[PDB]
Design a protein around this ligand. Structure first.
Ligand SMILES: C=CCN(C)Cc1nc([C@]2(O)CN[C@@H](c3nc(-c4ccc(C(F)(F)F)cc4)no3)C2)cs1
Length: 330
């Protein structure tokens, strides 16, 4: 089997991407943030504290003939930005772009933090990291991809995110019309539960390539590109007026600037992020200070190839027995 679904940015900055997901019988369609950096499928629901729901579409398990309480199971997760959610668990039928998993764990939120409440466009998250990160207790649950894997034509999914435009998540096949050139595959470590790999280096603008190993994760659920402070300083040094602002929380640059591109290495291949992809716009409405899309990973503890990086490529998440990541230009 295969599936294919369109993913759409939630706002004019590509802050996140939402993909429609069918849950239950009759189907309830919720727009979920597909997150290759976590492993929980959770939704706003009829159980979510009323004061914490503000415009989201909710999953109502009592209206699904295929929903079953997963008795005794609870979940609780926090994300790298400090947000969090928690609740109980149902199993139900879940379909993405025509691909169906029966008995998928659907984690129903009883509580969500303010950042989730405040984002009316995101109805939940669909985690696509390795199931070893799933937070359901006492019986850890599998991701949608892990459950679908055996049924897929090929044990892969692909992320083809758009720049200020819709994109595609495919499961079970590689769309050879969706990229240029060849896909370069690179080794994955699953030891931390992430799609963790090692980039071979970087270049800034038209500069020469610096060969240097950068361990990091491919994370569709993170907006920006987080790299070591040395790399990030070398990038922003090329932009007149750019500075790291403690009060804003990262590098800002004059909105009057044209940004250089940033290239990252995948083995012997190269992915070029256009400078425009690194512009996240005014720090506040009307400001002439703009927020940078390349930021330091110092104190995160891990480098993150988030959407800024991934949307410049066609990305293959190969979940074969020996997992790998593929990157192609597009
Ligand atoms: C070893 C150190 C790990 N440390 C915690 C840094 C990391 N962090 C992650 C993510 O937690 C998973 N991938 C990212 C993600 N963030 C979201 C999200 C968060 C908030 C909203 C809200 F604003 F609507 F609330 C929406 C989506 N979704 O995914 C972050 C992986 S590694």
């Amino acid at each position: 089997s295969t599936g294919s679904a369109t993913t759409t940015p939630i706002d004019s900055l590509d802050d996140a991407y939402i993909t429609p997901v069918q849950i239950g019988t009759p189907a309830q369609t919720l727009n979920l943030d597909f997150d290759t950096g976590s492993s929980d499928l959770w939704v706003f629901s009829s159980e979510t504290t009323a004061s914490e729901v503000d415009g989201q579409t909710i999953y109502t398990p009592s209206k699904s003939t295929t929903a079953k309480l997963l008795s005794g199971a609870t979940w609780s997760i926090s994300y790298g930005d400090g947000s969090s959610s928690s609740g109980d668990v149902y199993t139900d039928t879940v379909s993405v772009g025509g691909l169906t998993v029966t008995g998928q764990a659907v984690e129903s939120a009883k509580k969500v933090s303010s950042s989730f409440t405040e984002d009316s466009t995101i109805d939940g998250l669909l985690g696509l990291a390795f199931s070893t990160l799933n937070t359901v207790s006492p019986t850890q649950q599998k991701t949608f991809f892990d459950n679908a894997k055996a049924s897929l034509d090929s044990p892969v999914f692909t992320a083809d995110l758009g720049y200020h435009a819709p994109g595609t998540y495919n499961f079970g096949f590689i769309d050879t019309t969706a990229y240029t050139g060849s896909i370069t595959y690179t080794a994955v470590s699953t030891k931390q539960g992430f799609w963790e790999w090692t980039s071979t280096g970087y270049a800034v603008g038209s500069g020469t390539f610096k060969s240097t190993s950068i361990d990091g994760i491919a994370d569709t659920g993170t907006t920006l590109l987080y790299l070591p402070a040395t790399v990030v300083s070398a990038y922003w040094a090329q932009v007149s007026g750019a500075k790291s602002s403690s009060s804003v929380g990262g590098y800002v640059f004059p909105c009057s600037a044209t940004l250089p591109s940033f290239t990252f290495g995948v083995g012997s291949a190269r992915i070029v992020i256009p400078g425009d992809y690194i512009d996240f716009g005014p720090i506040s409405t009307g400001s002439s200070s703009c927020f940078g899309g390349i930021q330091s990973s110092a104190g995160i503890g891990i480098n993150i190839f988030g959407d800024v990086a991934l949307k410049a490529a066609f990305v293959v998440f190969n979940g074969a027995t020996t997992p790998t990541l593929g990157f192609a230009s597009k």
